[PDB]
Amino acid sequence: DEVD
Amino acid sequence: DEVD
Amino acid sequence: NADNSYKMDYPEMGLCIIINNKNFHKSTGMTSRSGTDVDAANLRETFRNLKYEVRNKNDLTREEIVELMRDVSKEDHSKRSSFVCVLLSHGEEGIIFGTNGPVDLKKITNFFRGDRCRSLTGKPKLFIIQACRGTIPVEADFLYAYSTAPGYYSWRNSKDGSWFIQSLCAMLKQYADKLEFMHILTRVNRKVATEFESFSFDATFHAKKQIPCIVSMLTKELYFYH
Amino acid sequence: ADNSYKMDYPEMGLCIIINNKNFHKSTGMTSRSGTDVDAANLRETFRNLKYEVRNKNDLTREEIVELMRDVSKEDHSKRSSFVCVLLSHGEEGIIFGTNGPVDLKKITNFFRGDRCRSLTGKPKLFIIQACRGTKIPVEADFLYAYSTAPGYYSWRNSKDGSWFIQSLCAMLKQYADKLEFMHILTRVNRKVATEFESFSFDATFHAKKQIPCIVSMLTKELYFYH
Ligand SMILES: [Cl-]
Ligand SMILES: [Cl-]
Numbered sequence: 120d121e122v123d
Numbered sequence: 124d125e126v127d
Numbered sequence: 128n129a130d131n132s133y134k135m136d137y138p139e140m141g142l143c144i145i146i147n148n149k150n151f152h153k154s155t156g157m158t159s160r161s162g163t164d165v166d167a168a169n170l171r172e173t174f175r176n177l178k179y180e181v182r183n184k185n186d187l188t189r190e191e192i193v194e195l196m197r198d199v200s201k202e203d204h205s206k207r208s209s210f211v212c213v214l215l216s217h218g219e220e221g222i223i224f225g226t227n228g229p230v231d232l233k234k235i236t237n238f239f240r241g242d243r244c245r246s247l248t249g250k251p252k253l254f255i256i257q258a259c260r261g262t263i264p265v266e267a268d269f270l271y272a273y274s275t276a277p278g279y280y281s282w283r284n285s286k287d288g289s290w291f292i293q294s295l296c297a298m299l300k301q302y303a304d305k306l307e308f309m310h311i312l313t314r315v316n317r318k319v320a321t322e323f324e325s326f327s328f329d330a331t332f333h334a335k336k337q338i339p340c341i342v343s344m345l346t347k348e349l350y351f352y353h
Numbered sequence: 354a355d356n357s358y359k360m361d362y363p364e365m366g367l368c369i370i371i372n373n374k375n376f377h378k379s380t381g382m383t384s385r386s387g388t389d390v391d392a393a394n395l396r397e398t399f400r401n402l403k404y405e406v407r408n409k410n411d412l413t414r415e416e417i418v419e420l421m422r423d424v425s426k427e428d429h430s431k432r433s434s435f436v437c438v439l440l441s442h443g444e445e446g447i448i449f450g451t452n453g454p455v456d457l458k459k460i461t462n463f464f465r466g467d468r469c470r471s472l473t474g475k476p477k478l479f480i481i482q483a484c485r486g487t488k489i490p491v492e493a494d495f496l497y498a499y500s501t502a503p504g505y506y507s508w509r510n511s512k513d514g515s516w517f518i519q520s521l522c523a524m525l526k527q528y529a530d531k532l533e534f535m536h537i538l539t540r541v542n543r544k545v546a547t548e549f550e551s552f553s554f555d556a557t558f559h560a561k562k563q564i565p566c567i568v569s570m571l572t573k574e575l576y577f578y579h
Contacts, residue, residue, distance in 0.1 A: 120552050121387075121508070121509050122506040123443060123507045124283065125282070125327075125332075126283070126332055127258045127281045127282075127283055265502075265505075266502045266566075276570060309569070312569075313569070314356075317572040321572075338490035338570050340492075340569070341567070341569040341570075342568050343542070343566070343569070344542060344567075
């Protein structure tokens with residue numbers, strides 16, 4: 120999971 | 124008419 | 128159908144808190160909001176017919192608004208299906224005026240966050256906001272029905288009340304026994320956008336139109352009947 | 354009658370997908386692993402809805418602005434609607450080109466009712482997967498389907514794509530032939546809010562949840578069929  |  | 132539609136057959140529909148700010152302290156430099164008592168009565172009647180417990184509050188300071196919301200958030204809403212709050216005042220983007228000055232809308236709504244008002248968790252919280260806007264997840268189950276788009280003015284007629292509240296009440300009266308709430312609000316958008324144009328001696332405010340703005344973080348469909 | 358947008362024009366409309374994966378090192382932004390999965394899912398989903406899909410990859414901020422300007426100057430007379438999907442890094446009101454930030458308002462302004470006459474009165478949908486860290490009204494007939502609430506982060510999985518876009522495609526595939534668009538987006542809200550929780554080595558980003566945010570200034574109901 121990564122953020123934008 | 125008037126604004127809020 | 129509790130999966131796709133909010134459960135609205137609790138013993139009570141819920142509270143409808145109407146904050147009606149008409150008269151403002153000299154220090155604010157804000158004019159009196161002629162027409163707003165017409166909105167407040169229209170709303171009180173409209174929500175009464177929907178079986179909401181309506182509480183009309185008038186001319187609250189910004190401290191009073193916060194304490195009211197705090198106290199309301201501390202009540203036991205276990206037997207209530209939903210919560211409604213209507214704010215009638217001057218405003219700017221993200222801000223509503225108490226009679227003595229501005230307060231952040233976030234301060235008002237934060238009391239109702241999922242982790243802060245447990246007896247409203249998973250139930251729709253509707254904030255209906257008539258004010259200008261000039262410039263589980265935390266916010267799940269909130270709906271903001273703004274009278275106008277971000278950055279824009281919102282118009283109020285001294286005789287008939289605000290364009291948005293007049294239209295909202297009319298559409299609830301006509302459609303709440305059939306239509307899901309987003310569809311009622313979509314008809315409100317259309318009515319305000321097509322049936323109103325401002326008249327003002329001040330050119331800045333004259334011959335203008337308005338479109339309301341629905342901001343939904345709801346997770347289910349909302350029908351005011353069951 | 355006047356309740357639903359006319360969707361029986363010869364064409365449903367364009368669906369412009371701007372898929373930004375790779376960013377210049379001077380931006381400080383990292384590659385958006387998983388975004389190609391989103392772009393592929395969208396392309397197929399919108400193709401099945403009979404939109405003419407154009408996929409654009411890795412556009413600079415100049416290219417984004419010029420693409421949108423150009424699309425806004427096409428003749429949309431035979432088209433029912435317009436869709437634009439933005440996949441990139443972002444902040445509130447901002448989407449990143451590969452080389453730096455673009456104000457979202459600059460992109461949407463090309464499509465205002467008074468600036469793209471062949472889309473006047475037709476729904477213009479902007480679907481945005483990005484973080485949000487902090488005669489007719491010109492804003493009428495826009496819908497912004499934001500992946501997250503104002504001020505919040507938005508999550509993307511390197512394997513599966515973004516929570517919002519995967520949920521949106523799933524709900525369109527399942528319901529586009531039978532539900533109105535706001536009701537489809539409401540299911541997307543619930544799916545995102547209930548089926549995902551973040552995993553991160555960085556505590557700032559770990560064990561978080563997300564709720565998308567529907568911002569509608571539409572004036573009619575939208576069905577992806579006639
Ligand atoms: Cl009055
Ligand atoms: Cl990828």
